[PDB]
Homo-oligomer: A and B are copies of this chain.
Amino acid sequence: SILKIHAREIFDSRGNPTVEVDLFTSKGLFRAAVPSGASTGIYEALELRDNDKTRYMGKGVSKAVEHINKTIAPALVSKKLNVTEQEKIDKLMIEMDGTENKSKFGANAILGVSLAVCKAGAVEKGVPLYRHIADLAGNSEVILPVPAFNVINGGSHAGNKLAMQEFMILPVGAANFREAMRIGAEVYHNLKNVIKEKYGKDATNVGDEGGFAPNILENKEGLELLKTAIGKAGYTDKVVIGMDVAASEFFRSGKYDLDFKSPDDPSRYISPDQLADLYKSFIKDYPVVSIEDPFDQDDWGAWQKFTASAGIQVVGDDLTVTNPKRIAKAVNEKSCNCLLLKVNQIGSVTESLQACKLAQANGWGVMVSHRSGETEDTFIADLVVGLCTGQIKTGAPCRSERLAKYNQLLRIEEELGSKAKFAGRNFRNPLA
């Protein structure tokens, strides 16, 4: 049923090239684009770049686009496969690539087609996208997740000393998704004033994900600002905090550098135990109910130890890279208790659903996620609803590559109507 596939180079939210795929069936044109991370774990499937330093600083993706146009497209068009057969199509592509990390075509080339196929499949069945995903995942129920807004940016997503990457607010106490959006926006706007008043207007510009990029170094200060904004906005009863440390970004031969954006100096490095205790103080002084990548992607010992003693949701991102094989090891060792789901870390919709199901079958929460480098594509909005994970982080309520997804979630809630369900305070396990 796939009649034509044509790929092109477009631009992501940082102004870097990325892959976009147009797929045609008798029902019409289906288009999807691929995201790109900045703090990408070493185990992620390969994002293929041209590396021609004279063009886009080496970041063109014309090779990936060519892999689709000269190889994947004609193969898929010849097989005359039905777009609703997601698994067969994804597997064909995985087999054609033949490599462990999709380095022959690039995970960006394979994912672009995978996503477009999925969108075409939903319309093929005359059902909403989240419903089709629900079907493919084997879910009957569908639910709106609690949104986690990265409202203060640090690490590799912002120009400041702040070492930890994301400071998120989650309106778990909202009545529904739309109120969750209203609460997120109001706290965000109150925060701009809190920051402005203390550090001046120059501290209110934004980082890659729309969060403010204040010129601070102390991660505790980041948390303190969120708490103040929450209180000022009058939502202390409905908002909790989440963090994404992206510790792999400041891992230094065994230790950690909480000032890695300043000229190196090993004398300031701290040990994993020191970092673990720092988080515990954060968990003690602030409503922090979730921490992502508290340690390096392969510092397995620290992860297991922290997850066993922190008492909160611990999210694996670079640790697991949406990879069933890495996930299996994490479940066995209890390295974490939540999976960050990034379709582009593994490269296909099918492997992404497999990774989600493996995590969910083992009592893990699952938070669907965007990449710091996004596009106007809104696939993950339908994905988190169809996978019933109950939680999603897709940016601060600023910069449309973020709001496109939130707005889509608002449209899904509306479409679901009176029978719409919202995870709320049960985001970790929405379907008890």
Interface size bracket, A side: 35 or more
Q: Are A399 and B397 in contact (CB under 8 A)?
A: no
Q: Are B201 and A160 in contact (CB under 8 A)?
A: yes
Interface residue A114 (Cβ < 8 Å from any Cβ of B): no
A215 to B158, CA, bound (A): 15
Q: Are A185 and B11 in contact (CB under 8 A)?
A: yes
Interface residue A406 (Cβ < 8 Å from any Cβ of B): yes
Among candidates B16, B185, B401, residue contacting A185 with C-beta atoms closer than 8 Å: B16
A16 to B161, CA, bound (A): 28
User: Contacting chain B: which of A42-50, A203-211, A281-289, A323-331?
Assistant: A203-211
Q: Mark A398-432, 1 if CB is under 8 A from B, else 0.
A: 11110110110011001000000000000000000
Interface residue A280 (Cβ < 8 Å from any Cβ of B): no
Q: Are A185 and B15 in contact (CB under 8 A)?
A: yes
Q: Mark A1-42, 1 if CB is under 8 A from B, else 0.
A: 000000010111111110010000000000000000000000
With contacts A20-B407, A407-B10 taken as known, whether A205 is within 8 angstroms of B400 at the C-beta atoms is: no
A189 contacts across to B, CB distance below 8 A:
15, 56-57
5 contacts between A and B (CB under 8 A): A10-B403, A159-B200, A376-B400, A376-B403, A399-B399
Residues of A in contact with B (beta carbons under 8 Å apart): 8, 10-17, 20, 55-57, 158-161, 181-182, 185-186, 188-189, 196, 200-207, 210, 213, 215, 261, 374-376, 396-401, 403-404, 406-407, 410-411, 414
